[PDB]
Amino acid sequence: ACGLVASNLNLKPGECLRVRGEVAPDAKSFVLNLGKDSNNLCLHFNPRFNAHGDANTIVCNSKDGGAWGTEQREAVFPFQPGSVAEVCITFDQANLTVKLPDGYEFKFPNRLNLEAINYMAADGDFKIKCVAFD
Amino acid sequence: ACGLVASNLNLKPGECLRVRGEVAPDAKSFVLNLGKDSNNLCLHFNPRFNAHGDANTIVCNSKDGGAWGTEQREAVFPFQPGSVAEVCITFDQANLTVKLPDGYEFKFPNRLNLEAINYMAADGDFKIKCVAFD
Ligand SMILES: CO[C@@H]1[C@@H](n2cc(-c3nc(Cl)cs3)nn2)[C@@H](O)[C@@H](CO)O[C@@H]1Sc1cc(Br)cnc1C#N
Numbered sequence: 001a002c003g004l005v006a007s008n009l010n011l012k013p014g015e016c017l018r019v020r021g022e023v024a025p026d027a028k029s030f031v032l033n034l035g036k037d038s039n040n041l042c043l044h045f046n047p048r049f050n051a052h053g054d055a056n057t058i059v060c061n062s063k064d065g066g067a068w069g070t071e072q073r074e075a076v077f078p079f080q081p082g083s084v085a086e087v088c089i090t091f092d093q094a095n096l097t098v099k100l101p102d103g104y105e106f107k108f109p110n111r112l113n114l115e116a117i118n119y120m121a122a123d124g125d126f127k128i129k130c131v132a133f134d
Numbered sequence: 135a136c137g138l139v140a141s142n143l144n145l146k147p148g149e150c151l152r153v154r155g156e157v158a159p160d161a162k163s164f165v166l167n168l169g170k171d172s173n174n175l176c177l178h179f180n181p182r183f184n185a186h187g188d189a190n191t192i193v194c195n196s197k198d199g200g201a202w203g204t205e206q207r208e209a210v211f212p213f214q215p216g217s218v219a220e221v222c223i224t225f226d227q228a229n230l231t232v233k234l235p236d237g238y239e240f241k242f243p244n245r246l247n248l249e250a251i252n253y254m255a256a257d258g259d260f261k262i263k264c265v266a267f268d
């Protein structure tokens with residue numbers, strides 16, 4: 001975790017986390033992690049421009065006691081090298097809902113049953129401009 | 135800090151950090167810490183409504199290897215219990231500049247000669263709602 005790390009977030013079900021940043025002009029990939037701590041992530045949100053054998057694909061996963069879950073890939077890639085992008089995340093007992101920069105929404109299943117999200121971390125080719133907590 | 139803790143901020147000289155939060159309805163005092171880590175703070179920003187023998191006074195200090203420096207007190211207190219408040223902070227080699235909710239500005243000397251601020255923490259009667267980087 002070499003980008004921003006925030007802890008003690010106490011983000012509750014139905015509350016909105018908003019992250020705005022600028023995608024690097026030569027971006028390969030970037031990451032937003034949410035969960036309890038670095039080893040227990042309800043969401044690893046990983047847009048891949050050209051990385052790990054994916055092109056223009058969002059890969060999401062969970063991490064439970066340091067172990068990756070099953071990957072989920074999306075049908076849409078509303079990111080552009082160089083461009084500002086905002087991502088909004090909420091959750092309930094069943095899913096996280098991720099709203100992307102073109103307003104497209106997808107759900108990622110809530111695997112860890114967290115009562116609250118206490119940890120967020122950013123990494124890769126995305127410079128954070130702001131974060132809002134409900 | 136029961137409040138938000140952020141690390142890897144990489145805030146550079148001349149960049150503006152904007153922190154917006156909610157002052158608790160019955161607020162006694164709150165803290166914003168900036169520096170290298172919890173033991174090495176270029177700014178401990180401590181508005182005291184009624185705490186530690188101060189009434190409606192901003193106390194600022196530095197912390198160097200765990201040691202509190204010489205306290206600085208301000209003549210102005212533009213905070214109200216049960217309100218939103220924003221503080222904006224920048225620095226150079228000589229001083230931090232703190233801009234308060236009514237636009238009042240004061241300087242606090244840069245005693246640790248930090249060339250980046252990597253650590254922020256909130257504590258006490260203030261819930262961080264938003265953080266912006268320039
Ligand atoms: C390559 O690693 C990635 C992981 N990764 C990316 C990053 C970073 N990117 C930046 Cl930017 C900064 S840090 N850190 N770890 C992660 O995205 C994971 C999600 O399932 O996929 C593969 S590992 C993996 C997991 C499973 Br399940 C199956 N196959 C593979 C692979 N390959």
Ligand SMILES: CO[C@@H]1[C@@H](n2cc(-c3nc(Cl)cs3)nn2)[C@@H](O)[C@@H](CO)O[C@@H]1Sc1cc(Br)cnc1C#N
Pocket residue numbers: 163164165178180186193194195202203204205257258259
């Ligand atoms: C009381 O403690 C405070 C310190 N403090 C406040 C908090 C918190 N407030 C919240 Cl809300 C959450 S955590 N934690 N530690 C700090 O503000 C310090 C600044 O100089 O003054 C005194 S200690 C001190 C330092 C010096 Br130099 C001289 N006298 C004293 C005292 N007393």
